[PDB]
């Protein structure tokens, strides 16, 4: 927690002192009501409207206000930035623009207006670099749209008019050259608006331990409310009664404030441990959720595989001098800058000796991806090398006249079935072979997924890429299932399915198509290499950027469940014992005989109640240093662990009330405040 | 006189276990829907004639059947009491009750409370007693035993939806259990001196010149069923100390046994129906430790007694102020604890004349929910609510998932358990608060000081827990008190029965899982201690301020 986060938490606390936002926390709302009643009683006493001591009720109001403010602050840090934000998607949507095109054909002007001014039927014009304004269907021209927010694969896809590949989307950046879009959806519901609504609008549940502890809190609060409320008629029977300020203060003193603060003590301590294990967590519930997850959804491109589909092997044609194929590929993909071109260059250069030929000072001329012939390459002195897909090269070769072979057909087929993205190299004619582009799994993943299967965590592997590849990668990696060709809504529906059965889900993704799903999962680990949309939707960033960081996350989660258990024992015992240490001081006024029940010989009811509020405050503040310290994380039976908790924690909790209130009261009387 | 107290408690518990272990097998045959040995053709003809052809019931249908039977009985008993100057068997031409008194009596008997704000010798007329109050003793006792049958079936049935037929449960319980046992007990009592006749009141002329008029109702049958089904509704004003209801000491011992009979049998049966006897012996251990400690405390308090007696001229200070000379003070102490723990309500001594601690212990036993050998059927499912609560809390303090008898418990049951555990204390505290804030409510107290408040608290505590007994100094025959106590009794009873049926309906549809690391065994001294802690701490954390201004204030005075 660097400085700015503490000041932000302080402001969110003061802002959350509003009664309309405190209402969602029963115990702290009752302390809020009691604080308000006591400050009002103090004002009514100071003004002269009531008789009594105004500085004792002012001191109780002031300490109840400190208890509430620190409770809100601790809850701020633990769960203040745990929600799924869509700030990056909204920023792309708001700072967007595009150029209206009079005279729908290309030969016209370009009126740059915001992207909200467009409507169905308009004719927009985009060129290299610009972000496509909204949905539509290209009418003129063809280019390479970078549809990596939708699918996931960062390889440019060709969009052109006439055929089937003519539908563009809003947000995907164009790369190759111009195209004339005509919008197809009113500004209301685009794809970007759809997924901005999916990100914000997906709520994360509360774990079962939280609900159980909340039910226990509310039960104890009802018990103490009935007791201390009905105290007045019973005590007013026997002559003198119980004061009113004493009543409200006793009520807000007895209720379980330690248990209310335990959720934030474990939150902060869990986030600290996570950071220690190189994961930046933003939600404290995420750690205990990781403690008891049951499924693990996984992206393929970006998460498991490196995410850029490097080159693997060369596969020449009949007697085409494979060395020639490698030299051609190296000298051809030289000028390229995308990882695939540099990868071809590296593979050829480290698989053969061709250092001499690489230089950028030579007179050759590089033909970039034109999106009209669909093949890049180079032209050197009396040379012409072209790298491109199978069908683009087929057209080029057929147009020249050279009859296309037959070996390449089966060869590229085989490469595709292997689970790669075949290319072809051609030196003017006589295609020199195929160059498979398969994507490589990150590293030592099969072992870790075996560990995840042993721990009892199913391992799905969702994807946005074709089935051939999702199958091959699911085989090599060693996952259980896979779902190729899954748009973002598909991933989100899968998460809702899996977590509607009661079990918890832990998705780990990196891209912008994972943000819906990451925003709905319980443990949403976003790779540090992922987009900003992914990192904002998730609730813990993985600075190692390794899919198999969950095997350490679930360890720290199990340990935070042990800690939460022992601290729960301590809290319950502290509350049950503070009831006995406090309540004997509400009878001294009714019957003098009941002084015999004052076992600790506390000074007076007023001093006892002031000691109780001070102790409540100090205990919530000290609960966090207790969680940080932790416990011994040994594997124990249910009964042995219960008995150990009872002995150390439950009994320490029993003794802390009495000694703490007595010492606080001793300080009050010694200092003279009484 | 501590050897005598120890021997009395030892013999009581020993004979009780001996008698109740064999009956538990019968109740287990009933919970498994198996017909008893010789009653399987009689049963066929009787069910065909009544039109109860077997067809199971989910929890909604079961609950509605029980509530419908109870409401029909309530209407019948109300109107019967109002119009008892038209019905036969009325030797002394008594008139029909009031609307407030008839309402309170109907509600009390229908809900197994048997709270008495009248005098049976001069109010009811041999037909309200015979064809009203004792018919409701049988029916309320069987309704209570049937709800617990449904709950044990929910615990032992794997992935089903139906808890068995309710009408067949009522008929089996009543005919095969409650009528024969009650007949034998009644014949014994009549042999020892109790009454059974329909004669007019007898006109005696004392040895001296005085005159007497003895009441002569059919006392023994209602005595037998009242004790056996922990109803506790006396035939006369002095409940079970009248020489015509408790003639000797043998009848008193047999009544003490009868009260605790079916509770204990239901615990042995619960253990036997799961195939694991340890499960049942755990409940018997938890319940017995509390009962023995309470009995010892009450006995010591009474044997210390009234300090002023030995200074006014008497020869000993023992408290013999509200006790029959036919039973001792040890026996009256044991019976006070027995009746208040057992939710019976039959009193062998005046609880108002007990000392401060003497009176405090029964009251607290009533206020913790009557989960120590509690009412017939009611005690066991109350204790099961507390067992689910203890299992939840233990799961909480180990960090693992809760689990009882294999089935995993979820938060819907925790919500229902919390509401069920919190209904009775709210009625107690709220009703006592309203009673103490209105002149009408606090003009009934007979005694001054904190003992008046103790009277009011004990009365609403008894009504809210369906106990029935009272201090009896409270002149609680008025519209305010009748209506207040009727509301308390009704809401307590049925607002507890409903969540139990909900929990049973939610548990019957699960499936018992396998052992894990979150499964702590629910026997052995650890869980017994955890369960005792839960019960006593809830009770204290609620009733300590209320008991510090009543019994403790007077004791420390």
């Amino acid at each position: 927690f660097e400085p700015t986060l503490v000041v932000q938490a302080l402001k969110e606390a003061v802002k959350k002192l509003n009664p309309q936002a405190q209402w969602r926390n029963p115990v702290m709302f009752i302390v809020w009501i009691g604080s308000l009643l006591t400050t009002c009683i103090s004002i009514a006493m100071a003004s002269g409207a009531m008789p009594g001591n105004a500085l004792f009720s002012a001191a109780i109001s002031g300490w109840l206000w400190i208890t509430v403010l620190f409770a809100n602050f601790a809850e701020a840090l633990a769960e203040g930035r745990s929600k799924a934000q869509a700030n990056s998607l909204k920023g792309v949507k708001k700072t967007a623009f595009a150029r209206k095109l009079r005279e729908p054909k290309y030969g016209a002007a370009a009126d740059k207006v915001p992207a909200d001014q467009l409507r169905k039927g308009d004719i927009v014009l985009v060129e290299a670099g610009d972000i496509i304004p909204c949905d539509g269907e290209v009418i003129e021209g063809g280019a390479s749209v970078d549809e990596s927010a939708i699918t996931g694969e960062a390889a440019p896809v060709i969009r052109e008019s006439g055929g089937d590949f003519a539908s563009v989307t809003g947000g995907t950046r164009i790369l190759s050259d111009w195209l004339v879009i005509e919008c197809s959806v009113n500004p209301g519901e685009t794809f970007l608006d759809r997924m901005i609504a999916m990100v914000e609008g997906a709520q994360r549940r509360k774990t079962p331990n939280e609900i159980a502890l909340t039910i226990l809190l509310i039960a104890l609060t009802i018990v103490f409310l009935l007791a201390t409320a009905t105290l007045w008629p019973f005590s007013a029977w026997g002559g003198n009664a119980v004061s009113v300020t004493v009543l409200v203060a006793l009520l807000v003193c007895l209720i379980p404030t330690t248990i209310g603060g335990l959720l934030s003590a474990i939150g902060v301590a869990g986030m600290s441990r996570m950071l220690g294990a190189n994961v930046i967590a933003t939600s404290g519930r995420a750690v205990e959720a990781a403690g008891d997850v049951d499924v693990l959804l996984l992206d393929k491109t970006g998460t498991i595989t490196l995410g850029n589909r490097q080159a693997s092997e060369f596969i020449p044609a009949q007697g085409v001098d494979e060395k020639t194929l490698a030299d051609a590929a190296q000298l051809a993909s030289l000028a390229d800058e995308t990882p695939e071109g540099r990868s071809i260059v590296i593979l050829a250069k480290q698989r053969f000796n061709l250092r001499e030929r690489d230089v950028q000072s030579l007179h050759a001329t590089f033909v970039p991806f034109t999106a009209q012939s669909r093949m890049s390459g180079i032209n050197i002195d009396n040379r012409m090398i072209r790298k491109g897909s199978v069908d683009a090269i087929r057209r080029h070769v057929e147009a020249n006249g050279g009859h296309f072979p037959t070996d390449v057909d089966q060869k590229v087929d085989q490469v595709a079935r292997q689970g790669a993205t075949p290319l072809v190299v051609v030196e003017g004619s006589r295609v020199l072979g195929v160059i498979a582009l398969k994507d490589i799994v990150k590293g030592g993943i099969k072992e870790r997924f075996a560990q995840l299967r042993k721990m009892g965590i199913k391992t799905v592997m969702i994807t946005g890429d074709n089935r051939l590849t999702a199958a091959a990668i699911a085989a090599e990696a060693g996952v259980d299932d896979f779902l190729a060709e899954a748009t973002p809504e598909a991933k989100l529906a899968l998460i809702r399915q899996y977590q509607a059965e009661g079990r918890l889900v832990a998705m780990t993704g990196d891209g912008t198509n994972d943000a819906p799903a990451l925003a709905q999962a319980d443990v949403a680990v976003a790779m540090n290499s992922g987009t900003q949309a992914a990192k904002e939707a998730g609730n813990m960033v993985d600075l190692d950027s390794n899919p198999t960081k969950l095997i350490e996350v679930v360890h720290i989660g199990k340990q935070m469940l042990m800690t939460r258990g022992s601290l729960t024992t301590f809290s319950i015992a502290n509350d049950v014992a503070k009831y006995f240490a406090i309540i004997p001081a509400a009878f001294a006024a009714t019957y003098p005989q009941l002084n015999a029940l004052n076992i600790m010989c506390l000074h007076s009811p007023d001093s006892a109640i002031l000691s109780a509020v001070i102790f409540n405050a100090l205990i919530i503040v000290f609960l966090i240093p207790l969680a940080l310290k932790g416990v011994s994380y040994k594997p124990l039976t249910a009964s042995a662990m219960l008995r150990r908790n009872l002995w150390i924690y439950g009994l320490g909790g029993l003794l802390v009330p009495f000694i703490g209130i007595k010492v606080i009261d001793l300080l009050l009387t010694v200092c003279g405040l009484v | 006189m501590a050897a005598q107290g120890f021997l009395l408690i030892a013999t009581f518990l020993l004979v009780l276990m001996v008698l109740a272990r064999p009956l538990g097998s019968g109740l287990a045959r009933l919970i498994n829907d198996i017909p008893l040995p010789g009653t399987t053709g009689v049963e066929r003809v009787l069910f065909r004639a009544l039109g109860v052809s077997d067809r199971e019931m989910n929890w909604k249908q079961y609950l509605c059947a029980i509530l419908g039977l109870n409401m029909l009985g309530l209407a019948v008993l109300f109107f019967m009491l109002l119009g008892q100057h038209y019905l036969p068997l009325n030797p002394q031409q008594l008139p029909g009750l009031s609307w407030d008194l008839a309402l309170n009596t109907a509600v009390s008997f229908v809900t197994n409370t048997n709270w008495r704000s009248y005098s049976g010798e001069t109010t009811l007329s041999y037909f309200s007693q015979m064809a009203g109050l004792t018919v409701q003793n049988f029916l309320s006792a069987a309704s209570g035993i049937a709800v617990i049958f449904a709950l044990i079936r929910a615990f032992t049935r794997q992935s089903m939806s139906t808890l068995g037929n309710a009408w067949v449960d009522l008929l089996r319980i009543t005919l095969w259990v409650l009528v024969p046992v009650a007949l034998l007990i009644a014949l014994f009592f009549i042999q020892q001196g109790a009454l059974q006749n329909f004669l007019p009141y007898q006109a005696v002329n004392t040895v001296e010149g005085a005159q007497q008029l003895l009441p002569m109702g059919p006392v023994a049958s209602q005595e037998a069923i009242k004790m056996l089904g922990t109803n506790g509704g006396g035939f006369f004003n002095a409940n079970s100390s009248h020489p015509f209801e408790n003639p000797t000491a043998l009848t008193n011992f047999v009544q003490m046994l009868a009260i605790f009979l079916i509770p204990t049998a239901l615990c042995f049966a619960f253990g036997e129906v799961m195939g694991d006897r340890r499960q049942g012996r755990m409940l018997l251990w938890a319940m017995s430790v509390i009962f023995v400690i309470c009995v010892g405390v009450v006995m010591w308090a009474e044997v210390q007694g009234n300090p002023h007696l030995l200074a006014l001229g008497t020869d000993s200070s023992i408290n013999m102020e509200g006790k029959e000379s036919r039973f001792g003070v040890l026996v009256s102490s044991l019976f006070a604890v027995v009746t208040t723990a057992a939710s019976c309500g039959a009193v062998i001594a005046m609880h108002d004349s007990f000392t401060a601690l003497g009176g405090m212990v029964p009251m607290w036993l009533m206020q913790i929910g009557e989960v120590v050998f509690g009412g017939v059927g009611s005690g066991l499912y109350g204790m099961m609510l507390f067992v689910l609560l203890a299992v939840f809390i233990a799961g909480l303090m180990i960090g693992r998932t809760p689990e009882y008898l294999g089935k995993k418990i979820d938060v819907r049951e925790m919500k229902l358990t919390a509401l069920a555990i919190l209904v009775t204390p709210t009625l107690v505290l709220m009703g006592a608060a309203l009673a103490m804030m209105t002149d009408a409510g606090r003009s009934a107290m007979l005694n001054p000081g904190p003992h008046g408040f103790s009277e009011v608290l004990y009365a609403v505590s008894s009504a809210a827990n369906n106990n029935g007994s009272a201090f009896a100094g409270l002149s609680a025959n008025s519209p305010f008190w009748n209506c207040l106590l009727a509301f308390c009794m009704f809401v307590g009873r049925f607002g507890v029965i409903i969540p139990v049926m909900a929990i049973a309906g939610s548990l019957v549809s699960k499936k018992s899982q396998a052992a894990s690391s979150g499964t702590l065994p629910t026997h052995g001294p650890l869980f017994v201690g955890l369960l005792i802690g839960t019960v006593l701490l809830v009770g204290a954390l609620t009733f300590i301020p209320a008991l510090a201004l009543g019994p403790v204030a007077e004791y420390l005075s």
Binding site: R205, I218, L225 | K415
Partner: peptide, 29 residues
């Protein structure tokens, strides 16, 4: 009846209703 006692009874009943409603909807709260 008075002003103080009536206000106190109203407040206690509101708090009890709020707590029982928060106990039935434990997930939201």
């Amino acid at each position: 009846m008075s002003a103080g006692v009536i206000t106190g009874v109203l407040l206690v009943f509101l708090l009890l209703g709020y707590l029982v409603y928060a106990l039935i909807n434990a997930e939201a709260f």
